């Protein structure tokens, strides 16, 4: 078996560690005729790949025909889980006979790429050197043993169709992850899902600019002997964009890190929670006015996306909820992380000063605790018990006194820990001074922006983005034009509730699998056949709902949640890929 | 054919002409 695939040595996308992860089961399933195709660049051979200058037990007459004739091509193992064999194509090696190539590409699938466009041409390139090597394999291999050919992306699927234009025998497996003029639909003020059925597909790919790169991928989708989608949705957008119905959909498994113990992910929960407490303490110094056992934690994160990935409706949902807890008189509060990494300068003054403050206060704690260790001891020495009239010592009191002094502030909270570079024209800090939350006393909703990836070597919050994820209590992910959806299998596997929806590749997953997605922790939405209020209103009652569980009944909700780990592993979503693999032999040759 | 080398060598990438995708449907359709 053959997979093809343009991020073998660079981590541009998801599919990087989707193959890592993949490469293991694939080869238990094909003992050691597991091959991979990549290209060869100079930033992935360091610390990326064992090249391996010794031919291939099985192979020597291909790869010495390859270096005789021009280009340039190396073997070796590739430095992931699993044993891998990785084949590394230079993109320069055969830079000489472009113009030949795109001469006899003219009668192949009728491609023209334009010049100035060096990606292209270097995946155009990449497919005839992969179909290159496939017609040099196989005029050496005898014809004794069948070759089936697997396509990951895009741009390497381009030389799939120029196999099909061989007459080679090989099944041919077509696998998209996402529509590249559909990113573009969704920036374009027009409503996406609810006009499925009718698209001026060849003019929306003209004057945009995107109109070869389309017109390729169907192509391939077209020619293929099987096409696999990641997800229903994609799979429906796909029938309804390239004209051809998947015979099967792919959704992305992920390799699960199990523990000895089933109740450990709760535990890493319980400590991480209180890092962020830690954290929340010192930006709310002066206002702690809130039973800190009775707060929740809601966080959203991935790519800075405004209406991709929902953002405003989660800020809505949030002031609604803010709205109704003002009127039920409750003591409940949430707090809402938006880990939105944009572009920032500096920290935020306020917020280190915070932390500062905290800490001055956790050294005199330990100061007067200290002091009052050494009187206890001296007491339980004589054999006598505290009457705690002499643990006053006139002193203490004065700088405990000024300390409360220096802790009391008169201006709001800040809502960001860093300083934008912008304020006119940032969408998430003008919606929130729209909507009304600035982190007031009389508030139940408290509202905290970091614009930057989690890392254990920040000052402020000295912790990743596993712990974070770990620590909170719910992540809602209103996901709009969400292809497949890796931040929420993440949670899931994690052991945390999240709120998804069936726009999403995971929300339309879960959906069709398990009945009743609720008692799960799964709340799904409905923003395919609903309005924006409609959809709102159900995120606002969703929330609500959250709120008003106890500690136990959130307890049997992780609980529960954990255990649909196993759905989302390579274990079980391997047997979507046997199966279109199956039906591409059975397709090419029985 | 000669006529449509340039218009997919720069980047014209024609459209409403003659050169339709389904102009390279009915030509690739015959391979299988
Ligand atoms: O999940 P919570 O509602 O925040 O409960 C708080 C903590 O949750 C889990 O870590 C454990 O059950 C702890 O025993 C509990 O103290």
Redesign the interface.
Known sequence: LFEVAWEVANKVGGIYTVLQTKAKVTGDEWGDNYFLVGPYTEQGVRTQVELLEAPTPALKRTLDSMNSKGCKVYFGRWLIEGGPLVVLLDVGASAWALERWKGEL?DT????????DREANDAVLFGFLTTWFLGEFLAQSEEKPHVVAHFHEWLAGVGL?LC??RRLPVATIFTTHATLLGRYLCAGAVDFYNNLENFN???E??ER?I??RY?ME??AA??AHVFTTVSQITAIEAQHLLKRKPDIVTPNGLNVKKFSAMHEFQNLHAQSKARIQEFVRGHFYGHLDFNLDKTLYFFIAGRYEFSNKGADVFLEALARLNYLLRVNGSEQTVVAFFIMPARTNNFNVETLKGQAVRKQLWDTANTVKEKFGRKLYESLLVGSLPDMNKMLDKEDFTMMKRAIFATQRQSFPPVCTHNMLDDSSDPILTTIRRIGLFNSSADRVKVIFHPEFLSSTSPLLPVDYEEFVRGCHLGVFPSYYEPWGYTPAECTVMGIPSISTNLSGFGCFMEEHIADPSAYGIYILDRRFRSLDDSCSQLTSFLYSFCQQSRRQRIIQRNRTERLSDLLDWKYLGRYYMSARHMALSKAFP | SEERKERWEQGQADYMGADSFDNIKRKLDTYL
């Open positions: 003219w699938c009728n491609i023209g790429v334009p010049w100035y169709c099909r234009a597909v060849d003019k790919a003209g600019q109109y070869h017109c169907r192509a077209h020619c």
